[PDB]
Amino acid sequence: STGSATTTPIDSLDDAYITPVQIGTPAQTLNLDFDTGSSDLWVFSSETTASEVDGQTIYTPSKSTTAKLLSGATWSISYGDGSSSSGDVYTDTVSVGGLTVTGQAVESAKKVSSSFTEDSTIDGLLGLAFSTLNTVSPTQQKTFFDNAKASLDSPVFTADLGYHAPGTYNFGFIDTTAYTGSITYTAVSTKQGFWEWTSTGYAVGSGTFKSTSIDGIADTGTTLLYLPATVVSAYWAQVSGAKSSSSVGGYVFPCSATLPSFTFGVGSARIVIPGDYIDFGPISTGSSSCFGGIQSSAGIGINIFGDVALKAAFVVFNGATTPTLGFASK
């Protein structure tokens, strides 16, 4: 089998992407944030504290003839950005772009933190990291991809995120028309539960490539590119008027400035992030100070190849017995 779904930015900055997902019978369609940095499929629901729901579409398990309580199961998650949610669990039928999994764990939120409530466009998350990170207790549950894997034509999914435009998540096949050149594959460590890999280096604009190992995660659920402070400083030093602002919480720059591209290495191959992809607009409405899309990972504890980086590439998440990651230009 295969599936193919369009993913759409939630706003004009590509702060996140939402993909429609069918849950239950008859189908209830919710717009979920596909997140290769976590492993829970959780939704706003009829069980979510009323005061914490503000415009989201909810899953109502009592209206699904295929929903079954996963008796005794609870879940609770906290994300790198400080947000969180928790609740109980049903199993139900879940379809993404034509690909159907029966018996998928659908984690129903009883509580969500303010950032989730405040984002009307995201009805929940669909985790695509390794199932070892799933938070359901007492019986850890499998991701949508893990459940689908054996039925897929090939045990892969791909992320093709757009810049200020829709893109595509495919399951079970590689669309050879969606990228230019070849796909370069690189080793993955699953030891922390992430799609963790090692970039071979970077360049800033037309500058010479610096060969240096940068361990990080391919994370569709993180907006920006977070790299070591040395790398990030080298980038922003090439932008007139850029500075790190402790009050704002990262590098800012005047929008009158031209942003150089940023290149990262995948083996001997190179992915070029155009300068425009690094502009996240005014820090506040009307401000001449713009927020940068490359920021320091210092104190995150891990480097994160988030949407800024991934949307510059066609990315293969290869879930073969020994997982790997593939990157192509596009």
Swiss-Prot record:
Catalytic activity annotation: Hydrolysis of proteins with specificity similar to that of pepsin A, prefers hydrophobic residues at P1 and P1', but does not cleave 14-Ala-|-Leu-15 in the B chain of insulin or Z-Glu-Tyr. Clots milk
Keywords: Aspartyl protease, Disulfide bond, Hydrolase, Protease, Signal, Zymogen
Active site per database record: D35, S199
GO MF entries: aspartic-type endopeptidase activity
Transmembrane residue ranges: none
Top-level enzyme category: hydrolase
EC number: 3.4.23.22
Location of the Peptidase A1 domain: 17-328
Cystine connections: C255-C290
GO biological process: proteolysis
Family per similarity comment: Belongs to the peptidase A1 family.
Protein name: Endothiapepsin
Organism annotation: Cryphonectria parasitica (Chestnut blight fungus)
Residues of the full protein shown: 90 to 419 of 419
